[PDB]
A paper describes a structure:
The CD4-binding site (CD4bs) on the gp120 subunit is an attractive target for HIV-1 immunogen design. The VH1-2-derived bNAb IOMA directed to the CD4-binding site of the HIV-1 envelope glycoprotein is of interest because, unlike the better-known VH1-2-derived VRC01-class bNAbs, it does not require a rare short light chain complementarity-determining region 3 (CDRL3). Here, we describe three IOMA-class NAbs, ACS101-103 derived from the VH1-2*02 and VL2-23*02 germlines, that share many properties with IOMA, including an average-length eight-residue CDRL3 and show up to 37% neutralization breadth. These findings indicate that IOMA-class NAbs developed in multiple HIV-1 infected individuals and provide important genetic and structural information for the design of CD4bs-targeting immunogens aimed at inducing IOMA-class bNAbs.
The cryo-EM complex was reconstructed to a ∼4.0 Å resolution, and we also determined crystal structures of the unliganded ACS101 and ACS124 Fabs at 2.2 Å and 1.7 Å resolution, respectively. ACS101 uses the VL2-23*02 gene for its LC and includes an eight-residue CDRL3, similar to IOMA. In the CDRL1 of ACS101, two residues are deleted to accommodate the N276 glycan and ACS101 CDRL1 makes contact with the N276 glycan via S29LC. While shorter in length, the ACS101 LC also forms this short α-helix in its CDRL1. CDRL1, CDRL2 and CDRH3 of the liganded ACS101 Fab in complex with AMC009 SOSIP showed subtle conformational differences compared to the unliganded ACS101 Fab, possibly due to the lower resolution of the cryo-EM complex (∼4.0 Å) compared to unliganded ACS101 crystal structure.
Residue numbers in the entry:
A (entry chain L): 3 to 9, 11 to 27, 27A, 28 to 94, 96 to 106, 106A, 107 to 210
B (entry chain H): 1 to 52, 52A, 53 to 82, 82A, 82B, 82C, 83 to 100, 100A, ...
Write the structure that this text describes.
Amino acid sequence: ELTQPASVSGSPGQSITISCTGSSIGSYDLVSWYQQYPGKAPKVIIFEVSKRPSGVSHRFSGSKSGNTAALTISGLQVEDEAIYHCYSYDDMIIFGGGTRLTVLRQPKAAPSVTLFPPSSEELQANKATLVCLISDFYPGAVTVAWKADSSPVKAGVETTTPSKQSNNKYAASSYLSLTPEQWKSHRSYSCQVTHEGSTVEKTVAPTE
Amino acid sequence: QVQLLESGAEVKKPGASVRVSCEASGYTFTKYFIHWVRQAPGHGLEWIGWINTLTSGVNYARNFQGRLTLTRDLSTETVYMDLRNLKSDDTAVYYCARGGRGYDEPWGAYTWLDPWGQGSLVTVSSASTKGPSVFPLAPSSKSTSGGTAALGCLVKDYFPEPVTVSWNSGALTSGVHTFPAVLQSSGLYSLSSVVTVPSSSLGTQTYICNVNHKPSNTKVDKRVEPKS
């Protein structure tokens, strides 16, 4: 119902805009924006399209055009790093997916990906788990896609949220649970990690 | 000053029910709605219902009429959320939030939601305490620096956290990366622990991951052999 981007990136001092689009945006003038730091509760920073609560930095500002609302952060500062949710109403309170905004504090770094096939022990036990370990990527925002041969695979995928390493890059894991037949039946399986417009793909075949 | 305070985290079996409280303070309890919004990990916030703290009138989301019950206690200024017939997809952080403006406007609950309680984590898992299955991750030099190989252990299906992993009884520490666990839809955790070691030692040095799951009193020393 409400569509907003998963992750956004911007350097300090510059400006950027997060877009939220939905049929409910044009209907009412209730679209709002909520800021959420990790481990804490969301907080309103823009409501009724463009109104700003007292105590909120004046750098935040909102607007809408047609069925697309927009939150604009001018003079980006480090404490703006957070999740920003859009809020509207369509026969009930409804929210977007949330946008992870990262204030770049180091160079964008692509992930290292390590892909393990199922253990022969696990296979002989009538189970199969492909393990895709992702590390050393900044910012902490990736999308993982599993492919059987070339066909995408959505069923059986379990992926963690990124976690901050000691070098302040991020790590994450994705697991593809598989039937032994499914594993032996295909030429290969691939773990595709997209990150900041770049992609890293590792592939394993049952004949290895 | 204006504060909403929720109860602690909960762990429930499927089919059970859970009661989360929300203690208000610093404002006229009966002038503002109390909404309830949950946040499943890696998902968008979802509204489930509000209660008029003055009249006790309620309004739930379509997916919750029948299994949800919101009540209010005027004397303790507390709202309670009762969710029945818990499924595994009910796992989420549950927030309460004050409804902006009040019971005077038609959209007097949908103006702004502020403040929010700190949230209460509810975890629906069919699993009582359970020890892990540990499988070997055979060495692979494909995505490691030159001359080294990555090997590890897959700690599959355990509950609850935590799990600790060492290698060779702690003698091997450099190159160890224990990744945070994933909470699967089954309600069970799984994690991996890998270690980058010299590729020449594979045929000489023994590599054992020492997994310790104290909740289930389970310990596993899994030797990781190379696949010749």
